[PDB]
Symmetry: C2
């Protein structure tokens, strides 16, 4: 009755401006209020970046000298390539952990100097990771970073933070543990500590607890008392200078036996080519670090790009972190990526342009040239509690998402499985388990979908489900049915079983008829079925061929253009010279009422 | 205007009859027309099952005696447990290939008798595969067999058929090749043949070509001339008896040097316990064979169950193939599963009940007891062309699905990738690549979805897309928008970019406004968005917070009950004391027209 029929439809300086973005803000600086907040931000984050680089470089197994070349070349190389404004690419601790695992595995395998073979592997893997980044940037692909969610990175970071807390337990007591690195790394290292426990010092426990007692309440105050104290108070450099000038005026290496940092050379040695022969044995870890560095840096650039009102790209933001692993790779460095704490404390004070990074470079220079005879005779336990107490965020995350179970109910499971599988197993296998599980969970969400009868809406033409709404009039039998899943091959059985349960069953009624009623029309509302496979059109043909036997008819309701393509172009299913497919479900009710 | 508001809704003999199904058809046989077609079918498939069992048992590396125990115990054990009627569980050639690979790998590793150590590994892996089957049946799980599609098995079968055709090239020429088994098995075996080619016989090529010349046109006639010749004509036993009674009356082992499988003892040796110490090194191949045997047997039972008008179960069909690998596992056998050719030639003639299988057992008994001195002095090349020319179906499949590219366009890619990755690499890695690729392809289908404006339908209340339909009236600006994907985290960027491209862009217009119009309502039709993640409600909040800045408003249209749950229960997004969510999109047009 009044079948509404529509009609189908028939069938080069612009590059230099991109690549070298120092030449698009430097000729107009607008120095009225562009300098002072920027310079103060640069000195503040430089003061708060001195004690972090030595600690992170000590975490990777090397001496705390090469981390200064790492952070310095990283801060000076982003000023010439980066298109963001508030990122400050420095050192990310999870990258230091992965680099430490790789250089420890290769030094344990192929070695048996130590201090110079701990640089060849790191520089080579950072060089080839940058080669991978510039190849992924020259192909302009970037499609891999969208498969990493944001309830997956926030579990991987917490798992790697547990691994950092475990691997900084030797320096908190001053023991000599073997290289226990592999698949059960946290459990084996903790049982190695608790077996070999009755050998700890009385010098590497008193200064550790005293420095923790100074650090942790002061950071707890500094986190939420920023009103009367505008700049963040640098207690880290204060306790480092106070600990160095006790263990050198007080002779804390002969009277006791605490660990003491190397010697620290002048700096800026002649550059060296990385070892080409170690390339094919290490190019499974460049994949491991390049993807996560690229993902974290593009997410943390775009999150701060639209907050201040400008635009950033993605074919150039890849190249800056690409060459950040290329040109410093010829200068005894390791991998770098974006910041989390440093960029927030950078943007919180001043920070009107990119030139802060240059000052972030520049104050390192003094540190790298005239502070070589100092920073001797400081403990390796002060740096341990420095890189321990600076883990407030990745363990503050436990307070929120196990109480934000109410929003998602299925991202909490992904987050907790990724955290558990990255603290216990490793960092690479943990990230792989997280990615594959978050991919599998959407097809688990497709399987077992919802279904219900529909019914009317009392004097309009809307149809909403009767399993979750109050009194709606239903016709005696023109029973409607609605499926909210794609219906491809995983859930052909769920669709068949749900349709046979809500309405009557065809085969049982056919058997009891042959051994020797109401509901004379079923209207499948296929508005939500948003593609369909080969088995999809097979089971939609099967329900019609079964239901036509008893004496009832089946007619679909408001399919998409592509489903209506794949039905007629599909096998032959339901259209040669018949109507049997409608445009609105209320029209199907009006037709089936005419009988 | 007249906001249609509904109201939300507040919140033991029955087991023996299953397990032992010989006791539910045997007391009433109805012998008027239940015997004769059944018995003739049993003798016909027994005659056509004698030459196949020796060939398949020779494919697995063992003597052609243990295959007779395999098929006999398989046919006699399903009569006591099986609930189907037309399956006839015999020997599946891909199972013989996987068993051959496993016993060849273990015999090459741990060995260096050969004929008795080629039974311990096969019997042990079939025993533990049956243990896996009865464990998967006692847990009543069965959810794994739905992840295997039907455009995936039909590529895996063709890839394993290429591997059978390659691995039966030694016996087609009579050479001595080493065990070239691994990851590049087909390529290495073909290059080993074509390097070592100038050593073939003149006896193992003349009888091979002569027997192929007899077999292949006769099977080509027998495939589509079944009218005047009702029963399938058994030319296989005819050419086997004609080839045996040439190479024993004609002395074809002294005058030439062709291969001949002698020995062949009477049979029914005392039973032996399988080797328990080889359990933990082989339980990665029981997973490989149990899943595919269970999948093929449940699919081929249900495909023939509803064709004749009865019902079958799934908690009992698992147990029959479970114990088919348990009780014959103590009697020097290997794995069995359902039939494809044998069940079609069984059901095509006679076949009124299950008792055909007993005759399928019974005619083996004569073969296993008094045909021991015969079946000596037959070539190993006749059995080669027997198991070659019986591959008509799995290579006839190349004519259909590369011309059924028009139905699916994405199952052809899955099928071809599975065939290519199972012919070249292996059978296990090929099946794994097929399963993981078919899982990944549905989330590739979610990514890059369709979008369009809607427009009216000219004097009704339907809305269909304007990118694929002819003239529909559109309001000047109340531009509608429709998304047909779940919108979780993979395609937040596609949704944001498509909405910013079809309608106006918020951020660019805000920038040009701040440097110093039409479309005063966007109605997102979210009828097809069938769940949403945390990032989903984040980007749906972000589009409202952006669009509210310029001076236009955004209101969603006809979400599901679960999306309307996850919006309000979600963060706070859009409902405390506001309307901002409708029930039908035409009502949203009527509201936005009032302005």
């Amino acid at each position: 009755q009044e079948k509404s029929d529509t009609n189908f439809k028939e069938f080069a300086k612009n590059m230099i401006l991109g690549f070298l973005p120092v030449l698009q803000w430097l000729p107009k600086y607008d120095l009225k209020k562009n300098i002072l907040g920027d310079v103060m931000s640069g000195l503040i984050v430089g003061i708060l970046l001195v004690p972090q680089s030595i600690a992170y470089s000590l975490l990777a197994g090397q001496e705390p000298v090469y981390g200064l070349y790492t952070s310095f070349f990283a801060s000076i190389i982003y000023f010439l390539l980066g298109t963001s404004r508030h990122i400050s690419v420095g050192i990310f601790g999870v990258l230091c952990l992965m680099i430490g695992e790789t250089v420890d595995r290769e030094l344990q395998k192929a070695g048996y100097d130590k201090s110079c073979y701990a640089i060849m592997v790191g520089s080579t893997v950072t060089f080839i990771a940058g080669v991978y980044q510039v190849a992924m940037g020259f192909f302009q692909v970037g499609f891999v970073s969208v498969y990493l969610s944001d309830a997956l990175l926030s579990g991987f970071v917490t798992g790697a933070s547990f691994t950092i807390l475990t691997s900084q337990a030797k320096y908190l007591l001053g023991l000599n543990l073997p290289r226990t690195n592999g698949v059960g790394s946290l459990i084996t290292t903790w049982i190695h500590v608790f077996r070999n426990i009755h050998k700890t010092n009385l010098c590497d426990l008193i200064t550790s607890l005293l420095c923790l007692l100074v650090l942790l309440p002061t950071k707890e105050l500094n986190e939420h008392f920023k009103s009367k104290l505008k700049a963040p108070i640098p207690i880290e450099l204060v306790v480092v200078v106070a600990a160095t000038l006790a263990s050198h005026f007080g002779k804390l290496h002969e009277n006791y036996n605490s660990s003491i940092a190397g010697h620290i050379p002048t700096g800026f040695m002649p550059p060296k080519v990385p070892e080409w022969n170690l390339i094919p044995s290490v190019a499974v870890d460049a994949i491991a670090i390049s993807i996560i560095g690229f993902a974290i840096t593009v997410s943390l650039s775009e999150m701060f790009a639209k907050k201040h009102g400008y635009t950033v790209k993605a074919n150039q933001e890849m190249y800056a972190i690409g060459f950040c692993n290329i040109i410093p790779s010829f200068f005894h460095c390791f991998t770098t990526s974006a910041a989390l704490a440093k960029t927030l404390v950078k943007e919180s004070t001043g920070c009107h342009t990119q030139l802060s990074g240059v000052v972030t470079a520049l104050v390192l220079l003094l540190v790298l040239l005239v502070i070589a005879p100092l920073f001797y005779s400081l403990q390796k336990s002060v740096l341990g509690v420095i890189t321990i107490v600076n883990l407030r965020g990745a363990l503050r995350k436990f307070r929120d998402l196990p109480k934000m179970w109410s929003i998602s109910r299925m991202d909490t499971v992904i987050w907790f499985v990724t955290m558990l599988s990255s603290a216990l197993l490793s960092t690479e296998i943990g990230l792989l388990v997280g990615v594959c599980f978050s991919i599998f969970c959407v097809i688990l969400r497709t399987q077992k979908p919802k279904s219900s009868l529909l019914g009317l809406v009392e004097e309009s033409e809307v149809f909403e489900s009767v399993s979750a709404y109050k009194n709606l009039q239903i016709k005696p039998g023109i029973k409607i049915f609605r499926f909210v899943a794609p219906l491809y091959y995983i859930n052909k059985e769920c669709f068949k079983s749900a349709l046979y349960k809500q309405t009557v069953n065809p085969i049982l009624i056919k058997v009891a008829w042959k051994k020797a009623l109401e509901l004379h029309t079923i209207v499948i509302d296929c508005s939500a079925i948003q593609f369909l496979d080969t088995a999809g059109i097979h089971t939609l043909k099967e329900v019609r061929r079964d239901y036509e036997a008893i004496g009832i008819q089946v007619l679909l309701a408001q399919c998409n253009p592509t489903v209506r393509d794949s039905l007629t172009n599909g096998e032959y299913c339901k259209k040669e010279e018949e109507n049997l497919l409608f445009y609105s479900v209320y029209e199907a009710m009006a037709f089936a009422e005419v009988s």
